[PDB]
Amino acid sequence: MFLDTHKQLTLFTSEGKLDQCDNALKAATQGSLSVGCVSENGVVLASLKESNNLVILSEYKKIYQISPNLGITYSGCQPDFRIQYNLSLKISEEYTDIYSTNIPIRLFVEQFSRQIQEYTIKKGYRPFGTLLLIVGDNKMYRVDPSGSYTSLQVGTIGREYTESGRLLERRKGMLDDNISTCVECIREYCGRSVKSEDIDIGVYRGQEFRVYSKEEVQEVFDSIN
C-alpha cells in the first residue's frame, strides 16, 4: 500500500523500547563532535566544522545564539537543527514579549523539550535527528530526540561522545584556562589538524552568552600553540 500519512511511525517494541527514537538517537550520535565545559566563572561551548564542499568556514556557523544569555549547538542532521532553532527563537521571543526579560535556561529547556517530544507522538512524523547542547545561566542542558533533557557539568554530543566526556572530566578548570583546556580535549577527536576556521567557541560569562569571532578563536589557539 502507498504511504499512510496517518501512520504512527514511533511505537514501543515488544522489549518496551521506542523503535524510531533509538534510530534518531543513533542518527544524532553520528554528527560532528561538540562539547561544553562548565566552570566556576562560566561555561564554554565548542564545536567542530567540516571544511568539505568548499564551505566558507568564516561564514558558516555551528554555535548559535537564542537569546542574549543562551547559546546552542547540535550534533546530527542540519535541517532538523535549523527547524528546532526556528522553534527555539520563537520560544525565547515569546517569553521576552510576555515577561520582557531574557528567558531562563530551565524554562526554555522545558518549553523546548516539550515541543521536541511532540514529534515522538505526532502521526506521520519522525523525531528530530539531532542532539542539542544549550549553554546559559551558568548551566548546560543536553536535549535528545526523545525530548528528554539533562543538566550537565561536562557534556559531549556527536562522535566520540562517551570517551570525550570522560576526557572533559580530566580537562576542567578556571573558565579563562578552561577554554584552552577543552580545546586540547577536543583536539584529540578531530580527523585533521585544527585551524581556527574549523572550530566555533561560545562562552557564557557573567550575564550573557557570546560566540567568539574567528579572530578570537585564533587567540585561543595561539595559547594552545
Partner: protein, 234 residues
C-alpha cells in the same frame, strides 16, 4: 523488493511508478504537432475501436483557451483533469491581466500541475504525454510534456506509440516557408507512414490548425478538406 508501491525513490534513484506511467503514455494514439512562422497544426489519430462511435464528433484536441489547445496520448482521461485545471488557471490569468498568457507561463502551469502527481503518495502519476500548442505575441510554440512533468518547447513533436517512426520523418522535414496546407499534407503522410496495419486498428484523422488565414484562432478542419490527402496516403 521493488519499491514501486508508491511514488518513491528506488535504491538507484529511479521512481518506478513514473516509468510505468511513461509505459502507459507511450502506448497511446499518436498526435503530431508541427509549428511554423505562418501557423500551427496538430494531427491526431482516432482509432476506430468500433464503427458505432461517431468519430467526427468525438474530439481528441481539447482547448485550454482561445489561444491554447492541447492533446494527450496514454490514459487520455487524465487530460480531463489537467485541461480543466489549466483552463481554470489560465482563463483567470488572461482576464486578470487583459493579455494573452505567455508560453513560459503556460509551461509553468503545465509543469506545476503535472508534478504534484509525481510528488505525492496517495496520488497516481499522470500517465500521459501531452502536447500543448499555444499562440503568444504572434508566435506559435509546441510544448511536449512527459509523465515526469518535464515539458520542452519543440519545432515539431509527436506523442503516442508511433512516435519513434514519426520523429525521424520530422527530423527529415524542413518547416520554414511551408504553407499550412503543406503542413497538413506532410502531417497526414507521416501519420500514415507510422500506421503499421498489422498491429494498430484503422483510424480517422482529426486536424486542428492555428494560422494567419484564421487570425490565429483554433479551427478544426472538416473531413472534406483533407479527404483527398487521406485517399492519396491510405
Amino acid at each position: 523488493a521493488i519499491l514501486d508501491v508508491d511514488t518513491v525513490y528506488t535504491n538507484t534513484g529511479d521512481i518506478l511508478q513514473i516509468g510505468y506511467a511513461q509505459k502507459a503514455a507511450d502506448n497511446g494514439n499518436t498526435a503530431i504537432c508541427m509549428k511554423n512562422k505562418k501557423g500551427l497544426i496538430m494531427i491526431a489519430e482516432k482509432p476506430i475501436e468500433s464503427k458505432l462511435y461517431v468519430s467526427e464528433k468525438n474530439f481528441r484536441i481539447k482547448k485550454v483557451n482561445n489561444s491554447i489547445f492541447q492533446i494527450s496520448s496514454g490514459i487520455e482521461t487524465d487530460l480531463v483533469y489537467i485541461n480543466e485545471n489549466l483552463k481554470n488557471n489560465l482563463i483567470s490569468e488572461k482576464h486578470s491581466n487583459d493579455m494573452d498568457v505567455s508560453h513560459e507561463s503556460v509551461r509553468n502551469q503545465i509543469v506545476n500541475i503535472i508534478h504534484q502527481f509525481t510528488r505525492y503518495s496517495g496520488v497516481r502519476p499522470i500517465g500521459i504525454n501531452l502536447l500543448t500548442c499555444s499562440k503568444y505575441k504572434n508566435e506559435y510554440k509546441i510544448l511536449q510534456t512527459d509523465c515526469t512533468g518535464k515539458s520542452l518547447f519543440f519545432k515539431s513533436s509527436v506523442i503516442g506509440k508511433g512516435s519513434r517512426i514519426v520523429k525521424t520523418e520530422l527530423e527529415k522535414l524542413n518547416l520554414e516557408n511551408m504553407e499550412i496546407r503543406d503542413l497538413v499534407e506532410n502531417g497526414i503522410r507521416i501519420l500514415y507512414k507510422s500506421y503499421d496495419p498489422l498491429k494498430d486498428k484503422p483510424f480517422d484523422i482529426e486536424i486542428g490548425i492555428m494560422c494567419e488565414e484564421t487570425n490565429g484562432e483554433f479551427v478544426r478542419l472538416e473531413k472534406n478538406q483533407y479527404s483527398e490527402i487521406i485517399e492519396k496516403y491510405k
